[PDB]
Design a protein around this nucleic acid. Structure first.
Ligand SMILES: O[C@H](c1cc(C(F)(F)F)nc2c(C(F)(F)F)cccc12)[C@@H]1CCCCN1
Ligand SMILES: O[C@H](c1cc(C(F)(F)F)nc2c(C(F)(F)F)cccc12)[C@@H]1CCCCN1
Ligand SMILES: [Mg+2]
Ligand SMILES: [Mg+2]
Ligand SMILES: [Mg+2]
Ligand SMILES: [Mg+2]
Ligand SMILES: [Mg+2]
Lengths: 40, 103, 125, 170, 207, 201
RNA sequence: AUUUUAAAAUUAUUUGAAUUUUUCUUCUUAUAAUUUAAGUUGUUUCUAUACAGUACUUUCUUAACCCACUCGUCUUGAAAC
RNA sequence: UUACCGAUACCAAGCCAUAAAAAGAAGAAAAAAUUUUUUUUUAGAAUCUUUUUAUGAGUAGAAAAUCGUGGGGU
RNA sequence: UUUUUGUUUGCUAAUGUAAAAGAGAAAUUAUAUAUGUACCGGUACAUAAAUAAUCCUAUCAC
């Protein structure tokens, strides 16, 4: 059900919203990358 | 990232065809992830460009392009018919084509 | 196919070559209409040479117009040049293949005076 | 002669009018020769006359045997057409002489045009079967030999487009 | 002027007859017998402060904010030069995919709307079309390479209309920029280019 | 069929249908690597299949069997033949398409590290009722003289161990990534985080 | 060089009616305009500030997709073994 | 049960011919320039011109319109 | 191997691509169930179950 709802959200999103999501992902990646580096 | 897509990818397939009759006036195009009639209709007015490379330079370049309009959907499975300014060469039958977002 | 340029429509740019003119030397390309049983061309089987037919003809209005839009008029002499003084936008001069060079030059000169186009000015130039 | 030369000062020509040799063998020989320094060609001819190196019969190869020397030209068939070779040699010699008479170095001369045309057949009669006369004609030839001494648009829009492309690349 | 047939209300715009056509059996006459051509009428998504993606230009894929419905049908667009790099650019409605996002919907930038509107109004149609003289001058440079380009650029700069346009653009930037900057995500979005990827089906997209 | 090269895992598929699927793709313009061809299933009973094969073999050219129907008995080879059958191979385009196809028994050098795809409309589990007789292609091949079946099986088994090893590592990596994500979700920005949560990620 | 008119329709007016009380309500008295009449015109590029270029035209050349059986002939019937 | 593909058949539009039908023994239009020049035309060939509509398979055969070759008078 | 410019007498500078626009994605296996994990194929516990309807990877120039 959750996945369905996620899919629906994705479908209905505005371009800006998609962009926002992308930005968020990028931020996470940055943070994630940093964490990985630290671990190393 | 260098270069921005902005088009849907496609494959320029056969001509519009009988079993053994040609019809070079229309080309059949498969558009990436569009599998149904309904989806196909979305692309109806979009402009299609077959871009191709050559050895001899022309207008000072090795790449030239033939333009088309995308005319109608084609049978149940998301394929579309496209009509071009000049008919496409059949050398093209397995090639990639671009379906732009304009109109 | 069809060869639109201006309003000038040509239905069939390809020449209709004689059947089998491509198979035996002795048979020239000049259209001849096939007769006799079992022709294939006569019978119009898919894949053979086409038969010239009246459908192919150009619109009565643009017919003998060349790409220029002027009817070609053959010119052997100044006297002949003269009928087209009141027609420089509708007929274009071609100088006869057999005209000597001086005469040709003269004709060309005349044409320029008249504002009439010459389609073959360059012969012996 | 058939070739487009431009400058005949660096060229030496030689011809054979109606040779009493077979057109096909001679043709083959000519082919073998072609695109070679004159002296080398002469040497080759000499060798063929003495049955040391063969000429490869590649065009008119119907029934011609299967020699050992043909491996030199990546072929299987080859022959040593004696009389024809001799004739060719003579013509080569003539050409050389002509060159000498002018002012061309024989070491730097290459055969640029070795043409063999077939002349009019010399008619003879052979007798066959049940009282039947048949043509026993020859295949004469003309030989022509030439030796030679051997050592946008701009458009403003287009320009703009190009510039843009360059920028993109950068 | 407008006509209301069958309940459409189409709106007429005065047009000029330019093409001449040969008469049947005497002297030529103008092609157009019609004096008024129906107005373009844009789609029910093109607004005054929405962000759109330019599909075809040199700034291909850039996200630029819409400015003025420029009466000639085609609209004016700005990606506030000091942020996105898109100048005061005239564009057709078809070569722009307008997103559902509006600038004047944000709480910070909504108050500076009247000024923007005024600025848009100030921009005109004839300020875009380059006069023939300039074109001629540009051409004259064809008869080294980069030097030519530089010359062309200089010529372009020289144009008084062009200068005016530039000034207008600058003014717009001044008006808008700081607010945009403050909305950092929004600014980033504006900056970035829209690219289709291997998941974006396009036909199911509601952007 | 817009990928560079599709690697198809032929295990658990139904032969003819699979071939058909391949052929169209090939025609369109897609490089296909049919991998693991020993485990392709045929819808007939094994014995029936064998009989059919025998019959096929029997139809050879009477004058000189050096020409005529070449009875290629490798499972991959068989698959290839089938594919060809469903193609206009006598033309140029058809030939090209045929060439584009590559068939492999088991898994070789590069096609162990590439993602293996499955054709769901051709699967045996989805196309046959489970009270009908089916036949493994490898077995059939063996029956009509292929010999290298056991060896192939052994190779496959060996590969499996390697895959398992790799898989474990992959799993570990995934877990690590997840952990990192969990850690870092609190280190971003509130609104952004919320947005991310909303969109599934 | 008068059926690219006349009317229809529409727009802004003006007189009288109607029951379908209605910013497309209809007829009608009169006037201008317009196009939904009365078969496509306009805007901006580009070719191009070119004389021929790699662009454009066209002849030839192979490709390629699809098709295509030796013509004449006598014959119910010929690609005909 | 839908959906679709699919003819030289059908429909819509053009153009070609054929057949028939309407009908026919005087006149300035526009553009570009800068009120006057320049640019185009300014039609009337009866088997001809303008327009309209329908139609177009074809061996044996018939007819018509053309096209070309050797010579003749003009 | 790296760099630069180019491939705009029969020759002696030299071009071609049936396919780049992110051509992204390595468990295995069953289909009336599989996969791990931990012990001894068996047991117990997890885990997938519209599985690519996903995940990864993009634009942060200077
Ligand atoms: O089409 C059948 C057939 C052929 C071949 C092939 F040619 F590939 F070896 N394989 C078949 C198989 C196969 F073994 F699965 F390949 C099964 C059933 C029929 C087959 C044969 C062909 C001759 C007449 C009917 N049986
Ligand atoms: O029919 C009139 C006409 C008159 C005369 C005339 F009376 F002079 F002999 N001759 C005509 C001729 C003519 F006989 F050849 F002279 C042809 C056509 C019309 C003619 C036309 C009427 C339209 C204007 C031209 N003359
Ligand atoms: Mg018959
Ligand atoms: Mg016959
Ligand atoms: Mg065929
Ligand atoms: Mg009989
Ligand atoms: Mg008829």
């Amino acid at each position: 059900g959750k996945k369905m709802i996620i899919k629906k959200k994705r479908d209905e999103a505005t371009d800006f919203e998609r962009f926002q999501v992308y930005f968020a992902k990028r931020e996470l990646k940055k943070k994630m990358t940093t964490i990985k580096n630290k671990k190393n | 990232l260098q270069a921005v897509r902005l088009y849907e990818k496609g494959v320029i397939l056969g001509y519009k065809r009988s079993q053994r009759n040609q019809d070079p006036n229309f080309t059949l195009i498969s558009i990436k992830n569009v599998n149904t009639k309904k989806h196909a209709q979305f692309y109806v007015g979009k402009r299609v460009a077959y871009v191709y490379r050559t050895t001899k330079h022309h207008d000072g370049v090795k790449i030239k392009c033939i333009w088309g309009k995308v005319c109608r959907t084609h049978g149940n499975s998301g394929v579309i018919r496209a009509k071009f300014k000049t008919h496409i060469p059949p050398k093209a039958f397995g090639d990639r084509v671009r379906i732009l977002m304009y109109p | 196919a069809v060869k639109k340029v201006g309003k000038i429509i040509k239905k069939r740019t390809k020449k209709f070559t004689r059947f089998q003119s491509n198979r035996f030397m002795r048979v020239k390309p000049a259209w001849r209409k096939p007769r006799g049983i079992d022709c294939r061309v006569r019978r119009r089987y898919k894949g053979t040479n086409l038969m010239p037919s009246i459908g192919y003809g150009s619109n009565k209005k643009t017919k003998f117009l060349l790409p220029n839009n002027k009817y070609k008029y053959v010119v052997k002499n100044v006297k002949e040049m003269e009928p087209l003084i009141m027609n420089h936008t509708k007929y274009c001069v071609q100088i006869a293949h057999n005209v000597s060079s001086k005469k040709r030059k003269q004709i060309i000169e005349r044409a320029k005076q008249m504002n009439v186009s010459v389609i073959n000015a360059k012969a012996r130039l | 002669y058939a070739k487009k030369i431009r400058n005949l000062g660096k060229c030496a020509k030689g011809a054979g009018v109606d040779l009493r040799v077979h057109f096909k063998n001679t043709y083959e020989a000519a082919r073998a020769i072609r695109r070679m320094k004159l002296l080398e060609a002469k040497k080759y001819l000499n060798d063929v006359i003495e049955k040391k190196r063969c000429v490869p019969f590649r065009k008119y190869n119907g029934g011609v045997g299967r020699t050992n020397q043909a491996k030199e030209f990546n072929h299987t068939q080859g022959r040593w057409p004696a009389k024809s070779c001799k004739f060719l040699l003579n013509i080569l010699d003539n050409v050389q002489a002509n060159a000498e008479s002018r002012n061309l170095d024989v070491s730097k001369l290459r055969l640029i045009h070795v043409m063999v045309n077939k002349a009019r057949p010399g008619r003879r009669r052979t007798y066959k079967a049940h009282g039947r006369i048949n043509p026993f004609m020859s295949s004469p030839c003309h030989i022509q030999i030439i030796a030679r001494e051997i050592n946008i648009s701009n458009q403003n829009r287009l320009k703009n487009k190009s510039v843009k492309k360059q920028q993109t690349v950068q | 002027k407008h006509y209301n047939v069958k309940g459409k209300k189409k709106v007429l715009v005065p047009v000029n007859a330019k093409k001449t056509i040969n008469k049947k059996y005497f002297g030529r006459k103008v092609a157009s017998k019609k004096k008024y051509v129906v107005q373009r009428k844009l789609r029910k998504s093109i607004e005054v402060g929405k962000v759109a993606i330019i599909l075809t230009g040199k700034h291909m894929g850039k996200r630029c904010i819409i400015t003025k419905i420029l009466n000639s049908g085609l609209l004016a667009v700005v990606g506030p030069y000091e942020i996105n790099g898109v100048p005061l650019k005239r564009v057709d409605s078809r070569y722009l995919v307008v997103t559902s996002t509006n600038i004047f919907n944000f709480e910070n930038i909504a108050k500076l709307k009247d000024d923007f509107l005024n600025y848009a109004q100030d921009i005109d149609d004839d300020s875009f079309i380059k006069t023939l003289e300039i074109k001629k001058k540009q051409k004259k440079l064809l008869k080294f390479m980069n030097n030519v380009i530089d010359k062309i650029k200089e010529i372009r700069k020289e144009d008084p209309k062009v200068q005016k346009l530039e000034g207008i653009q600058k003014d717009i930037g001044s008006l808008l920029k700081p607010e945009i900057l403050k909305n950092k995500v929004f600014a980033h979005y504006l900056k970035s280019k829209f690219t289709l990827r291997n998941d974006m089906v396009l036909h199911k997209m509601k952007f | 069929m817009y990928k560079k090269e599709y690697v198809i895992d032929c295990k658990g598929h139904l032969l003819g249908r699979l071939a058909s699927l391949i052929a169209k793709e090939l025609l369109n313009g897609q490089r296909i690597v049919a991998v693991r061809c020993e485990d392709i299933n045929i819808s007939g009973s094994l014995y029936r299949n064998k009989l059919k094969y025998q019959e096929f073999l029997r139809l050879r050219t009477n004058t000189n069997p050096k020409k005529g129907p070449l009875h290629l008995r490798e499972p991959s080879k068989i698959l290839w033949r089938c594919v060809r059958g469903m193609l206009p191979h006598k033309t140029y385009k058809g030939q090209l398409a045929l060439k584009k196809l590559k068939v492999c028994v088991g898994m070789p050098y590069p096609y162990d590290k590439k993602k293996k795809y499955v054709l769901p409309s051709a699967l045996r589990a989805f196309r046959l009722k489970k009270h009908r007789r089916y036949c493994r292609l490898g077995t059939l091949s063996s029956r009509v003289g292929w010999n290298y079946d056991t060896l192939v099986k052994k190779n496959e088994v060996l590969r499996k161990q390697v895959s398992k090893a790799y898989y474990k590592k992959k799993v570990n990596n995934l877990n690590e990534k997840k952990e990192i994500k969990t850690e870092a979700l609190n280190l971003i920005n509130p609104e952004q985080r919320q947005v991310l949560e909303n969109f599934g990620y």
